[PDB]
Ligand binder design. Structure first.
Ligand SMILES: NC(=[NH2+])c1ccc2nc(C(O)(O)c3nc4ccc(C(N)=[NH2+])cc4[nH]3)[nH]c2c1
Ligand SMILES: [Ca+2]
Ligand SMILES: [Mg+2]
Ligand SMILES: [Zn+2]
Ligand SMILES: [Zn+2]
Ligand SMILES: [Zn+2]
Length: 223
Protein backbone atom coordinates (compact mmCIF):
# COMPACT_ATOMS: atom_id res chain seq x y z
CA UNK A 1 0.00 0.00 0.00
CA UNK A 2 1.61 3.29 -0.96
CA UNK A 3 0.83 6.51 0.91
CA UNK A 4 -1.17 4.60 3.52
CA UNK A 5 -0.83 4.42 7.28
CA UNK A 6 -0.37 1.80 9.95
CA UNK A 7 -3.85 0.41 10.60
CA UNK A 8 -3.06 -0.66 14.12
CA UNK A 9 -2.95 -4.19 15.49
CA UNK A 10 -6.05 -6.17 14.66
CA UNK A 11 -8.14 -3.19 13.49
CA UNK A 12 -9.02 -5.01 10.25
CA UNK A 13 -10.09 -8.35 11.83
CA UNK A 14 -11.25 -9.99 8.51
CA UNK A 15 -7.82 -9.51 6.82
CA UNK A 16 -5.87 -12.65 6.09
CA UNK A 17 -2.32 -13.30 4.88
CA UNK A 18 -1.76 -16.21 2.49
CA UNK A 19 1.55 -17.81 3.23
CA UNK A 20 3.45 -20.45 1.26
CA UNK A 21 6.58 -20.09 3.35
CA UNK A 22 6.37 -16.28 3.26
CA UNK A 23 3.46 -13.89 2.77
CA UNK A 24 2.54 -13.59 -0.89
CA UNK A 25 -1.04 -12.34 -0.93
CA UNK A 26 -3.90 -11.15 1.28
CA UNK A 27 -7.46 -12.28 1.51
CA UNK A 28 -10.75 -11.77 3.41
CA UNK A 29 -12.50 -14.16 5.80
CA UNK A 30 -16.19 -14.47 4.82
CA UNK A 31 -17.23 -16.99 7.56
CA UNK A 32 -15.33 -19.40 9.95
CA UNK A 33 -14.41 -21.90 7.10
CA UNK A 34 -13.97 -19.79 3.91
CA UNK A 35 -11.74 -16.99 2.52
CA UNK A 36 -12.12 -15.04 -0.79
CA UNK A 37 -8.91 -13.81 -2.45
CA UNK A 38 -7.81 -13.11 -6.07
CA UNK A 39 -7.29 -15.88 -8.63
CA UNK A 40 -3.90 -14.47 -9.69
CA UNK A 41 -2.78 -15.33 -6.12
CA UNK A 42 -3.47 -19.00 -6.88
CA UNK A 43 -0.78 -21.50 -5.65
CA UNK A 44 -0.79 -24.98 -4.23
CA UNK A 45 0.38 -25.36 -0.58
CA UNK A 46 -1.31 -22.31 0.96
CA UNK A 47 -1.56 -21.75 4.76
CA UNK A 48 -4.00 -18.99 5.85
CA UNK A 49 -2.88 -16.72 8.75
CA UNK A 50 -5.64 -14.87 10.68
CA UNK A 51 -5.13 -12.34 13.55
CA UNK A 52 -1.97 -11.04 12.06
CA UNK A 53 -0.54 -7.61 12.38
CA UNK A 54 3.28 -7.98 12.27
CA UNK A 55 3.65 -11.03 9.96
CA UNK A 56 7.21 -11.63 11.05
CA UNK A 57 6.39 -11.83 14.80
CA UNK A 58 4.11 -14.26 16.65
CA UNK A 59 2.35 -11.58 18.75
CA UNK A 60 -0.28 -13.90 20.21
CA UNK A 61 -3.52 -13.42 18.20
CA UNK A 62 -2.75 -15.56 15.20
CA UNK A 63 -4.40 -18.68 13.97
CA UNK A 64 -2.46 -20.47 11.12
CA UNK A 65 -4.72 -22.90 9.19
CA UNK A 66 -4.09 -24.82 6.04
CA UNK A 67 -6.41 -24.64 3.04
CA UNK A 68 -8.26 -27.89 2.20
CA UNK A 69 -9.37 -26.70 -1.27
CA UNK A 70 -9.02 -23.65 -3.60
CA UNK A 71 -11.60 -22.79 -6.30
CA UNK A 72 -10.53 -20.29 -8.94
CA UNK A 73 -13.49 -18.62 -10.69
CA UNK A 74 -14.51 -20.84 -13.66
CA UNK A 75 -14.20 -17.96 -16.16
CA UNK A 76 -10.92 -16.39 -14.84
CA UNK A 77 -8.80 -15.04 -17.72
CA UNK A 78 -5.17 -14.73 -16.61
CA UNK A 79 -4.40 -12.59 -19.56
CA UNK A 80 -6.99 -9.86 -18.93
CA UNK A 81 -7.51 -10.66 -15.25
CA UNK A 82 -11.25 -10.60 -15.85
CA UNK A 83 -13.01 -12.61 -12.98
CA UNK A 84 -10.06 -12.33 -10.64
CA UNK A 85 -11.54 -14.04 -7.60
CA UNK A 86 -10.84 -17.39 -5.86
CA UNK A 87 -12.30 -19.08 -2.72
CA UNK A 88 -10.16 -20.99 -0.25
CA UNK A 89 -11.67 -23.41 2.23
CA UNK A 90 -9.88 -23.93 5.57
CA UNK A 91 -9.00 -27.32 6.94
CA UNK A 92 -10.56 -26.39 10.33
CA UNK A 93 -12.96 -23.59 11.03
CA UNK A 94 -11.34 -20.54 12.54
CA UNK A 95 -12.39 -19.39 16.02
CA UNK A 96 -13.83 -15.92 15.54
CA UNK A 97 -13.27 -13.25 18.16
CA UNK A 98 -12.50 -9.52 18.32
CA UNK A 99 -9.27 -9.98 16.40
CA UNK A 100 -10.53 -12.54 13.83
CA UNK A 101 -13.98 -11.63 12.35
CA UNK A 102 -15.66 -12.27 8.96
CA UNK A 103 -16.74 -9.47 6.63
CA UNK A 104 -20.19 -9.27 5.04
CA UNK A 105 -20.83 -9.65 1.34
CA UNK A 106 -22.77 -6.84 -0.25
CA UNK A 107 -26.52 -6.70 -1.08
CA UNK A 108 -25.97 -4.12 -3.90
CA UNK A 109 -22.92 -2.65 -5.62
CA UNK A 110 -21.45 0.65 -4.29
CA UNK A 111 -21.55 4.02 -6.07
CA UNK A 112 -18.62 6.04 -7.30
CA UNK A 113 -17.70 8.55 -4.60
CA UNK A 114 -18.01 5.98 -1.88
CA UNK A 115 -14.85 5.87 0.32
CA UNK A 116 -13.45 2.40 1.06
CA UNK A 117 -10.64 0.94 3.17
CA UNK A 118 -8.01 -1.20 1.47
CA UNK A 119 -5.25 -3.00 3.40
CA UNK A 120 -2.32 -5.34 3.04
CA UNK A 121 1.35 -6.06 3.65
CA UNK A 122 2.21 -5.19 0.03
CA UNK A 123 4.93 -2.91 -1.34
CA UNK A 124 4.88 0.68 -0.05
CA UNK A 125 7.23 2.43 -2.56
CA UNK A 126 6.02 3.45 -6.05
CA UNK A 127 9.56 3.61 -7.29
CA UNK A 128 11.38 1.08 -5.09
CA UNK A 129 10.82 -1.93 -2.92
CA UNK A 130 9.97 -1.61 0.77
CA UNK A 131 7.80 -4.31 2.29
CA UNK A 132 6.22 -3.61 5.74
CA UNK A 133 5.84 -6.04 8.59
CA UNK A 134 2.61 -4.55 9.97
CA UNK A 135 -0.68 -3.99 8.17
CA UNK A 136 -1.06 -0.81 6.20
CA UNK A 137 -4.39 0.81 5.47
CA UNK A 138 -5.52 3.29 2.86
CA UNK A 139 -8.87 5.01 2.36
CA UNK A 140 -9.68 5.71 -1.30
CA UNK A 141 -12.93 6.43 -3.14
CA UNK A 142 -14.41 4.45 -6.04
CA UNK A 143 -13.84 6.36 -9.24
CA UNK A 144 -16.37 6.68 -12.01
CA UNK A 145 -16.08 3.98 -14.69
CA UNK A 146 -15.42 6.77 -17.17
CA UNK A 147 -12.13 7.86 -15.65
CA UNK A 148 -11.24 4.15 -15.07
CA UNK A 149 -11.77 3.30 -18.72
CA UNK A 150 -9.87 6.37 -19.97
CA UNK A 151 -6.88 5.36 -17.89
CA UNK A 152 -7.04 1.82 -19.27
CA UNK A 153 -8.76 1.79 -22.71
CA UNK A 154 -10.21 -1.63 -23.76
CA UNK A 155 -8.91 -3.24 -20.59
CA UNK A 156 -11.79 -2.72 -18.14
CA UNK A 157 -14.85 -5.09 -18.01
CA UNK A 158 -18.03 -4.85 -16.00
CA UNK A 159 -16.38 -7.12 -13.36
CA UNK A 160 -13.85 -4.49 -12.39
CA UNK A 161 -13.86 -0.93 -10.98
CA UNK A 162 -11.10 1.50 -10.19
CA UNK A 163 -10.53 3.18 -6.84
CA UNK A 164 -7.84 5.60 -5.93
CA UNK A 165 -6.36 8.94 -6.76
CA UNK A 166 -5.69 10.05 -10.34
CA UNK A 167 -3.04 12.43 -8.98
CA UNK A 168 -1.03 9.31 -7.96
CA UNK A 169 0.56 8.87 -4.52
CA UNK A 170 -1.90 6.47 -2.95
CA UNK A 171 -2.61 2.95 -4.24
CA UNK A 172 -2.62 -0.73 -3.27
CA UNK A 173 0.34 -2.58 -4.90
CA UNK A 174 1.73 -6.15 -5.40
CA UNK A 175 1.48 -8.02 -2.09
CA UNK A 176 -1.87 -6.33 -1.27
CA UNK A 177 -3.17 -8.67 -4.00
CA UNK A 178 -6.38 -10.62 -3.09
CA UNK A 179 -6.89 -8.20 -0.24
CA UNK A 180 -10.07 -6.43 0.76
CA UNK A 181 -11.66 -3.18 -0.32
CA UNK A 182 -14.45 -2.45 2.21
CA UNK A 183 -16.97 0.37 1.70
CA UNK A 184 -19.84 0.85 4.21
CA UNK A 185 -19.40 -2.50 5.98
CA UNK A 186 -19.36 -4.75 2.91
CA UNK A 187 -16.57 -6.31 0.99
CA UNK A 188 -16.89 -4.60 -2.41
CA UNK A 189 -13.50 -5.29 -4.13
CA UNK A 190 -10.50 -7.57 -4.15
CA UNK A 191 -7.01 -6.03 -4.86
CA UNK A 192 -6.44 -7.16 -8.52
CA UNK A 193 -4.18 -5.02 -10.76
CA UNK A 194 -2.82 -1.64 -11.72
CA UNK A 195 -0.06 -0.08 -13.87
CA UNK A 196 2.95 0.15 -11.52
CA UNK A 197 1.79 1.53 -8.17
CA UNK A 198 0.59 4.99 -7.20
CA UNK A 199 1.28 6.42 -10.64
CA UNK A 200 -0.57 9.47 -11.84
CA UNK A 201 -3.60 8.60 -13.98
CA UNK A 202 -3.06 4.86 -13.30
CA UNK A 203 -5.50 4.08 -10.41
CA UNK A 204 -5.82 0.55 -8.90
CA UNK A 205 -8.27 -1.88 -10.46
CA UNK A 206 -10.36 -4.10 -8.24
CA UNK A 207 -12.58 -7.15 -8.81
CA UNK A 208 -16.27 -6.07 -8.51
CA UNK A 209 -17.45 -8.55 -5.80
CA UNK A 210 -21.16 -7.55 -5.93
CA UNK A 211 -21.26 -9.45 -9.29
CA UNK A 212 -20.17 -12.69 -7.60
CA UNK A 213 -22.36 -13.10 -4.57
CA UNK A 214 -24.56 -15.86 -6.00
CA UNK A 215 -21.42 -17.78 -7.23
CA UNK A 216 -19.79 -17.42 -3.82
CA UNK A 217 -22.90 -18.56 -1.87
CA UNK A 218 -23.63 -21.45 -4.19
CA UNK A 219 -20.01 -22.55 -4.20
CA UNK A 220 -19.50 -22.52 -0.45
CA UNK A 221 -22.78 -24.30 0.21
CA UNK A 222 -21.87 -27.14 -2.12
CA UNK A 223 -18.25 -27.68 -0.88
N1 LIG B 1 6.12 -12.56 -5.62
C1 LIG B 1 4.91 -12.62 -5.16
N2 LIG B 1 4.62 -13.35 -4.12
C2 LIG B 1 3.90 -11.90 -5.76
C3 LIG B 1 2.56 -11.95 -5.25
C4 LIG B 1 1.50 -11.26 -5.81
C5 LIG B 1 1.83 -10.52 -6.90
N3 LIG B 1 1.04 -9.81 -7.60
C6 LIG B 1 1.69 -9.26 -8.56
C7 LIG B 1 0.95 -8.33 -9.61
O1 LIG B 1 1.76 -8.14 -10.77
O2 LIG B 1 -0.11 -9.15 -10.05
C8 LIG B 1 0.22 -6.97 -9.11
N4 LIG B 1 -0.70 -6.93 -8.23
C9 LIG B 1 -1.12 -5.73 -8.06
C10 LIG B 1 -2.10 -5.24 -7.22
C11 LIG B 1 -2.33 -3.88 -7.27
C12 LIG B 1 -1.59 -3.02 -8.15
C13 LIG B 1 -1.86 -1.67 -8.20
N5 LIG B 1 -2.96 -1.23 -7.65
N6 LIG B 1 -1.02 -0.87 -8.79
C14 LIG B 1 -0.60 -3.59 -8.99
C15 LIG B 1 -0.42 -4.95 -8.88
N7 LIG B 1 0.39 -5.72 -9.52
N8 LIG B 1 2.94 -9.63 -8.47
C16 LIG B 1 3.04 -10.42 -7.44
C17 LIG B 1 4.14 -11.09 -6.92
CA1 LIG C 1 2.28 -11.98 13.81
MG1 LIG D 1 -4.12 -7.47 1.31
ZN1 LIG E 1 4.11 -8.76 -10.33
ZN1 LIG F 1 2.20 -5.78 -10.93
ZN1 LIG G 1 -1.04 -8.95 -7.19
Amino acid sequence: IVGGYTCGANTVPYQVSLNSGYHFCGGSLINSQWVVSAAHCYKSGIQVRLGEDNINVVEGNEQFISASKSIVHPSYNSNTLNNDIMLIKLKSAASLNSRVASISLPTSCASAGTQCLISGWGNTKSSGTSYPDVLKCLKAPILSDSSCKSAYPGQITSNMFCAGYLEGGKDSCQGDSGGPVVCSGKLQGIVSWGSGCAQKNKPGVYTKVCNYVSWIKQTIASN
